[PDB]
Amino acid sequence: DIQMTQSPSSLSASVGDRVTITCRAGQNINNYLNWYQQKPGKAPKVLIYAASNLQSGVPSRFSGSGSGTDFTLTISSLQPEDFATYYCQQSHSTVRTFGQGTKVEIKRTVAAPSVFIFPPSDEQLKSGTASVVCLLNNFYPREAKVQWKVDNALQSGNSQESVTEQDSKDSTYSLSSTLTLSKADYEKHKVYACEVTHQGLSSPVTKSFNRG
Amino acid sequence: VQLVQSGAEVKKPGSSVKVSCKASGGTFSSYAISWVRQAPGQGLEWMGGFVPISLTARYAQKFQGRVTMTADESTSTAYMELSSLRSEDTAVYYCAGALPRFCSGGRCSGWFDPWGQGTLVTVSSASTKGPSVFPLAPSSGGTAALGCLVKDYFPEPVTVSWNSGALTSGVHTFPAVLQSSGLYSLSSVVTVPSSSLGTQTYICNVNHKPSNTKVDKRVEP
């Protein structure tokens, strides 16, 4: 099986800047090397086939180069809709082999999160468990800290976080912190607060509610 | 030209799964479909294809003795069967068209052009559990946020739409996280102007196909 060593495993650049990805093969694969782009959630789309030929529909900034073993996928000025994972693949031998894959991220200017807090619905409460949700909407960069406080008691180990993929148009992130308590623990305290820290905020903001 | 694959399934360790892939566009030979798997967040693995001069199947060494590929030409669909399932085989399985180009001596060196949407096969002994959907109700500027909370389901594939596909802007459905109970939970939120609270009804549509569970849970103040 033809070893296909792709580099780098991940990269990030500003919108407009030039990026390159590398694929070196075990032995001569002639020209039979193809590049695929997989945006998050979708199947891979062919991008460049036979090393250098661009499959129409794909913008001009993408470009292919190489012959023999050393191949390079160049994209000339990276755009927000290029957030994806890119794969090289050889079509020389019967047993097709892929590259490791390269995740491409976009760096942008800072953008402050909008913060929302959500109390548990009346119907979820009726089934013994209760979860509180905090939402950080459309912020860059990713690094952010959310803290939960029940009656000013700082929580730990009862929350989990999800974060979306980089948005294809504005390049921001969004984050959901879900705090789960037993219904009994929920009805024993009154004030629930979500404290979020970020680079786009002069000082932390807290969204909160009382149970009534 | 399109290829449409079967649905997400759950198989218990040691059983077998048979995925389908149907060509539904121009003229497409099902014997020209190959199969590529993508373990969760882990890159692509080629499984097998059909050699065009003998129309005999060739499989990657990892799957030989476990994989069987077939193709019905009138039906215009291609099948991939993977037996003796273990936990590593939990993955998204893609069918891709391998139309012949740059051929020599009966072997071709082309690419994979049309890809299927991919079916997600989860192997586990845990039972399929349906989700419970709860509303996340609203309460700067003039923008406000609402949402649905999809909780306590298994396996993973769950889809959420807003207003039966109408609402497409400002919606964020987060990746589902695995709770301590071994069941999945995610949230789907979307931002809206405050003006439209009451003067617009927002309804989310959750579909957890492995448990055959569609639900529409209305979110309002």
Numbering used by the authors:
A (entry chain L): 1 to 212
B (entry chain H): 2 to 52, 52A, 53 to 82, 82A, 82B, 82C, 83 to 100, 100A, ...
Q: What text does the study give?
A:
Several potent bNAbs bind a conserved HCV glycoprotein E2 epitope using an unusual heavy chain complementarity determining region 3 (HCDR3) containing an intra-loop disulfide bond. Here we report the identification of new antibodies containing an HCDR3 disulfide bond motif using computational screening with the Rosetta software. The tip of the HCDR3 loop in previously characterized VH1-69-derived, HCDR3 disulfide bond motif-containing Abs forms a β-hairpin that interacts with an epitope in the front layer of E2. The Ab HCDR3 loops interact with E2 mostly through backbone-backbone interactions of the β-hairpin at the tip of the loop.
However, there is also a possibility that these Abs were indeed elicited in response to HCV infection and contain additional mutations that facilitate correct placement of these HCDR3 loops and/or shape other regions for interaction with the antigen. Moreover, both HEPC3.1 and HEPC3.4 originated from the subject C110 sequence pool but were discovered using the bNAb HEPC3, isolated from the subject C117, as a search template, confirming that the P3SM approach can successfully identify Abs that evolved independently for binding the same epitope. Interestingly, in cases where both native and chimeric Abs showed binding (HEPC3.1/HEPC3.1HCDR3 and HEPC3.4/HEPC3.4HCDR3), the native Abs displayed stronger binding and broader reactivity to E2 proteins than the chimeric Abs. In HEPC3.1 and HEPC3.4, on the other hand, almost half of the HCDR3 loop sequence (8 and 9 positions out of 19, respectively) is altered. As expected, in contrast to HC33.1 bNAb that bound equally well to 1a157 E2 ectodomain and 1a157 E2ecto ΔFRLY, both HEPC3.1 and HEPC3.4 failed to bind to 1a157 E2ecto ΔFRLY, suggesting that the new Abs target the AR3 antigenic site similarly to HEPC3 bNAb. To explore structural features of the discovered Abs, crystal structures of the antigen-binding fragments (Fabs) of HEPC3.1 and HEPC3.4 were determined to resolutions of 2.8 and 3.3 Å, respectively. Contrary to our expectations, both structures revealed a bent HCDR3 conformation like the one previously found in the AR3C, AR3A, and HC11 bNAbs, rather than an extended (straight) loop as seen in the HEPC3 mAb that was used as a template for this P3SM search. An overlay of the HEPC3.1 and HEPC3.4 Fab HCDR3 loop tips with known Ab co-crystal structures does not reveal significant clashes. Despite previous experimental evidence supporting HCDR3 loop bent conformations as effective interaction geometries for certain HCV AR3-specific Abs (AR3C, AR3A, and HC11), the long length of the HEPC3.1 and HEPC3.4 HCDR3 loops (19 amino acids) coupled with obtaining only their apo state crystals remain the possibility that presence of the bent conformation may be a crystallographic artifact.
